[PDB]
A = this chain, B = another copy of it.
Amino acid sequence: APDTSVSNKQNFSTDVIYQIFTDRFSDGNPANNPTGAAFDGSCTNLRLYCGGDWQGIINKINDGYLTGMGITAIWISQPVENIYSVINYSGVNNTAYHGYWARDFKKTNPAYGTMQDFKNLIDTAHAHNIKVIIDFAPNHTSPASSDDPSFAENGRLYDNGNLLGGYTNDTQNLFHHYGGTDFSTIENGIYKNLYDLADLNHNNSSVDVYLKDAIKMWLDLGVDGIRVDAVKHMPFGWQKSFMATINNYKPVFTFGEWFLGVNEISPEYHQFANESGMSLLDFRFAQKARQVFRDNTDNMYGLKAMLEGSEVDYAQVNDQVTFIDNHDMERFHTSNGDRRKLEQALAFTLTSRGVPAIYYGSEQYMSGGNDPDNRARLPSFSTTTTAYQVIQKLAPLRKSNPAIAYGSTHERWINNDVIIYERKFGNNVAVVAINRNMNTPASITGLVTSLPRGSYNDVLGGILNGNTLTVGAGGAASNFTLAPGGTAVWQYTTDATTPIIGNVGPMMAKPGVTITIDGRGFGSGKGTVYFGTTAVTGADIVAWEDTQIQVKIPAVPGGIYDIRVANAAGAASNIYDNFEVLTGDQVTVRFVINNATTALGQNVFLTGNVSELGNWDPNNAIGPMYNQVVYQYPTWYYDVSVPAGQTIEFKFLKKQGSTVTWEGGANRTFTTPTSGTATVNVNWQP
């Protein structure tokens, strides 16, 4: 099937995501509305249920509101049954309208709909070529107090109606009981509770298996993507075994939320995007885009530096989900802010690298502060706003122009207020020019592009005051004045003769899994896929066509491989690196080491004989291990994804700067479980 197909659940760069708070979009079925204290039909108390549901989204796909805008994927609230309690927090009543307070991950939230309503939403979305992404929040169940078991539903977890347990009297340790986080360390934020939310214990085998069975059920119902809540707050080794469960079963595009503030660049955030098996909401993009287009706290050089820097720091930049606002920030459009600012920031996001997400109601110029005020019901379904038309004109280019979906980003002209950038993929080109200054025109002289000679018409049709671009010989444009607030997009597409890989999904899986390689120029006849120097041909290539190849991962040793395609004529593609072949299915094992005393800046790590443990390489060792909450120094601990059902060999080490101190003695051995978790508890061998 081609790369742009709705059946491509693995890669979303050709898509535009519309993020819906299900309760706040459309009430298509009033019979499923919560009653009494839990419901507010006027939606003026934004902490209560207003009535929006899966039938309302079906109705808006059907009548052309969503499809008219060019949307090709929707991201909805977590679908699972939530608690029914109305919680009073300091006067204000609060309900689970947002879908984040789960009680049963195997059932639906009936305010949103039934299992049949969910099936009908999947089938309507697919019939209209829209992919469906669901939130999934495996970190916690709901607000709970173990001291007061009558508060809310005491964080209770059920498995298809069957009670597994609550927070009070948790004799099975389904939950963490360490108090609440103060967010001081990443360790602190993982094992302590977020606010009053009952923290699930993923080291408990019943919790691990339950959540893995639950995600497979939603994959069996046809979902096409997953957005994981609070990835900063769950053990990264458990989330890698969770991603291996998805990828080795039915791989679908998965991304998480790790919040970053203005000007925060975090190593851990970039490591997580690069090594977890999921991508991230691109807060680095979003925060700089709001500084340049909204708050004017940075200029075009800051935007350029973010695009140039992120291209390097994210191993797969085409998988990162970009946005200009969402449920965790003030709405981009403000009361006293010019609407052209929103329109430009949307045109920039839709033409930039990554997978663009638009927060519902952006096209209706909704304004509002932070939660709950950024989640008002959307006030209108007018299809004639400039913002609606901006998305309607640009969002189809992700499907039709491979340069927009996959290309490189090249700054061609810049000054403090103007950027002109080019996206390029093979011979496909798009050029975007943005003047954020609203009172001064920009004189553009000396613009060179990769466009062939011609008079290119602005894809926006002059609605954001764009103009035609005349390109002569050598891609040189004739000079022009870009209007105050001007935004224009120019493009050229052709068929590629060289194979070029634009995206690969999934990025981590065991031998025998089919991955999806998307791009252009592969040709019609089956050629060769290289995983390192290993060639895969014939029957192992499950499908081959010019924009997409599906191929089985060869039985190569676990490790990181470069992927390369050669078409039937032997012409080879660019290399798409950082593919992780797993040793096999994964389980999370907690490694605990006692009596590992360290100096200042010296930390304990783990390594061993499988790729999952760094293959005995100190530079790739697992850690630094943790040593504050579940166990305290000099005992260190860490939850690590490792191959299931096999005897691994390992050793601990201390590292400080360039010095590695290994444990002495014989190498340690451990036979991992086939599913569930296990704990290894040992003592430092000098």
A570–chain B nearest beta-carbon distance, Å:
9
Residues in B with CB closer than 8 Å to A446 are 298-302, 304-305, 416
Residues in B with CB closer than 8 Å to A265 are 474
Residues in B with CB closer than 8 Å to A530 are 533
Complex Cα spacing A147 to B683, Å: 101
A427–chain B nearest beta-carbon distance, Å:
12
Complex Cα spacing A562 to B562, Å: 15
> Taking the complex as formed, is A679 at the interface, i.e. its CB lies under 8 A from any CB of chain B?
no
Complex Cα spacing A299 to B370, Å: 47
Complex Cα spacing A562 to B564, Å: 13
Q: Does A413 contact B301, Cβ atoms closer than 8 Å?
A: yes
Determine the residue in chain B with the shortest Cβ distance to A448.
Answer: B305
Residues in B with CB closer than 8 Å to A448 are 301-302, 304-305, 308-309
Q: Mark A406-435, 1 if CB is under 8 A from B, else 0.
A: 000011011110000000000000000000
Residue in B415, B575, B617 whose CB lies within 8 Å of A415: B415
Residues in B with CB closer than 8 Å to A414 are 414
CB-CB under 8 A for A447 and B301, given A265-B474, A575-B575: yes
Residues in B with CB closer than 8 Å to A661 are none
Residues in B with CB closer than 8 Å to A474 are 265
Q: Which of A300, A302, A410, A446 has the most CB of B within 10 A?
A: A446
Complex Cα spacing A301 to B414, Å: 10
Complex Cα spacing A276 to B304, Å: 38
> Taking the complex as formed, is A445 at the interface, i.e. its CB lies under 8 A from any CB of chain B?
yes
Complex Cα spacing A562 to B474, Å: 29
Q: How many residues of A contact B (CB 8 A)?
A: 30
Complex Cα spacing A569 to B299, Å: 44
Q: Give chain A interface residues in 287-329, CB to chain B under 8 Å.
A: 298-302, 304-305, 308-309
Determine the residue in chain B with the shortest Cβ distance to A265.
Answer: B474
Residues in B with CB closer than 8 Å to A415 are 415
Residues in B with CB closer than 8 Å to A416 are 445-446
Complex Cα spacing A171 to B298, Å: 78
A674–chain B nearest beta-carbon distance, Å:
31
Determine the residue in chain B with the shortest Cβ distance to A569.
Answer: B617
Q: Mark A612-627, 1 if CB is under 8 A from B, else 0.
A: 0000010000000000
Q: Does B445 contact A301, Cβ atoms closer than 8 Å?
A: yes
Q: Mark A433-477, 1 if CB is under 8 A from B, else 0.
A: 000000000000111100000000000000000000000001110
Complex Cα spacing A617 to B298, Å: 53
Q: Give chain A interface residues in 367-389, CB to chain B under 8 Å.
A: none
Complex Cα spacing A27 to B475, Å: 50
A480–chain B nearest beta-carbon distance, Å:
14
A268–chain B nearest beta-carbon distance, Å:
15
Complex Cα spacing A416 to B299, Å: 18
A133–chain B nearest beta-carbon distance, Å:
32
Determine the residue in chain B with the shortest Cβ distance to A411.
Answer: B411
Complex Cα spacing A476 to B476, Å: 31
Determine the residue in chain B with the shortest Cβ distance to A497.
Answer: B619
Complex Cα spacing A212 to B530, Å: 42
Residues in B with CB closer than 8 Å to A410 are 308
A445–chain B nearest beta-carbon distance, Å:
7
Residues in B with CB closer than 8 Å to A447 are 301
Q: Mark A658-674, 1 if CB is under 8 A from B, else 0.
A: 00000000000000000
Residues in B with CB closer than 8 Å to A299 are 445-446
A187–chain B nearest beta-carbon distance, Å:
23
Residues in B with CB closer than 8 Å to A562 are 572
Residues in B with CB closer than 8 Å to A572 are 562
Residues in B with CB closer than 8 Å to A301 are 413, 445-448
Residues in B with CB closer than 8 Å to A617 are 569
Residues in B with CB closer than 8 Å to A298 are 446
A343–chain B nearest beta-carbon distance, Å:
24
Complex Cα spacing A446 to B569, Å: 47
Residues in B with CB closer than 8 Å to A305 are 446, 448, 475-476
13 contacts between A and B (CB under 8 A): A298-B446, A299-B445, A300-B446, A301-B413, A301-B445, A304-B446, A304-B448, A305-B448, A308-B448, A309-B448, A415-B415, A416-B445, A530-B533
Q: Which A-B residue pairs are the 10 nearest by beta carbons?
A: A301-B446, A305-B448, A533-B533, A302-B446, A265-B474, A299-B446, A415-B415, A301-B445, A414-B414, A301-B448
Contacts A300-B446, A301-B446, A305-B476 supplied; 11 other A-B pairs, CB < 8 Å: A265-B474, A301-B445, A305-B446, A305-B448, A305-B475, A308-B410, A309-B448, A416-B445, A416-B446, A533-B533, A569-B617
